[PDB]
Write a protein that binds this ligand. Structure first.
Ligand code: NI
Length: 341
């Protein structure tokens, strides 16, 4: 049974609700992005209309095999009518293809569903500038003040400098980057660009990247592992055992691995600056955990919400405990009293 925070009142619409079977009254199923917790349930046998971005629709067709007749891609930043209701898709600053959805209800209420997002001041000059929002369905993944992390640009500066230094000292070092979903592609693309290399990967990962409309992608990636000195591997293999095993396979081409694990937040964020990050090392293998987030920090979230001034907030993450729900409600009330809405 579909929970309330996935239903859009006054419509036949749901958001990210494919794991509940046929939802009573649903005439259109929106999908915000191609992450498994949100697409859970979609397959080639699905026969209801799915509304999404172009990039998400490429992934549904090629990776999940959803038939073409049920995929409805919409352009961004464009007023569209769906089943008699005006909607707009906005860039969510999350992974490739990720959107927020603005719903203009027949009764005059305006609803914003963020999907998953990383709030940015540039969102204050989108189509959100133009009118009032009554209800906000909010990605509250990091809604607590302990959740701090640097800008994505600082994190990429750290990774590029770390990789370029290591490989210039040792031309026989290999760089490896972990992945388990779409998102965070700038980590491996920026490192391969500074090293003058394509990124090597499995056929399955190549296929996924080929769905993402990245400019000049054919110049940037390859399935020929041997020609490349930046390899992608599944996140589970990013440990001393998995990496040892990988170095064996390269036929004595390399004598050192430097590996990156992009995580979300970890408690080593509470004491250490990005500049001061050190790896875990065993012999000729070193592993860096780097805090590259595609979700809002607490401060970015608070700024967005204080600017938007919604009348009501419905959290979409951390909703399963009374303690989480109570904590989040307290911060919403602080924010509202501080800003005066
Ligand atoms: Ni996500």
């Amino acid at each position: 049974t579909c929970p309330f925070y996935k239903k859009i009142p006054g419509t036949g619409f749901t958001v990210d609700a494919f794991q509940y079977g046929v939802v009573e009254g649903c005439t259109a199923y929106f999908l915000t992005h191609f992450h498994s917790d949100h697409y859970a349930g979609l397959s080639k046998h699905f026969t209801f209309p799915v509304y999404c971005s172009e990039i998400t629709g490429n992934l549904l067709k090629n990776k999940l095999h959803v038939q073409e007749q049920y995929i409805h891609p919409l352009p961004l930043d464009t007023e569209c009518i769906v089943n008699g209701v005006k909607v707009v898709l906005l860039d969510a600053n999350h992974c490739p293809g990720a959107v927020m959805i603005l719903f203009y209800l027949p009764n005059g209420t305006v609803i914003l569903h963020t999907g998953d997002f990383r709030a940015d001041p540039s969102m204050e000059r989108s189509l959100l500038a133009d009118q009032k929002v009554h209800m906000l369905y909010l990605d509250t993944t990091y809604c607590s003040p302990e959740y701090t992390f640097p800008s994505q640009q600082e994190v990429i500066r750290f990774a590029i400098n770390t990789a370029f230094e290591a490989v210039t000292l040792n031309p026989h070092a290999l760089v490896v980057c972990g992945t388990y979903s779409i998102g965070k592609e700038k980590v491996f693309l920026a490192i391969a660009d500074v090293l003058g290399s394509k990124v090597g990967m499995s056929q399955e990962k190549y296929k996924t990247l080929q769905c993402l409309n990245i400019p000049e992608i054919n110049s940037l990636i390859t399935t020929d592992m041997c020609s490349s000195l930046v390899h992608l591997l599944p996140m589970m293999q990013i440990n001393f055992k998995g990496l040892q095993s990988h170095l064996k396979k390269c036929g004595g081409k390399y004598n050192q691995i430097l590996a990156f694990r992009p995580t979300g937040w970890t408690h080593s964020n509470k004491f250490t600056r990005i500049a001061d990050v050190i790896p875990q090392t065993k012999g000729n293998i070193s592993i860096y955990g780097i805090p590259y987030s595609e979700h809002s920090s607490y401060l970015e979230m608070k700024r967005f919400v204080q600017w938007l001034k919604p009348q009501k907030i419905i959290p979409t993450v951390n909703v399963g405990t009374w303690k989480s729900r109570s904590t989040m409600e307290k911060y919403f009330r602080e924010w509202k009293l501080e800003a005066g809405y």
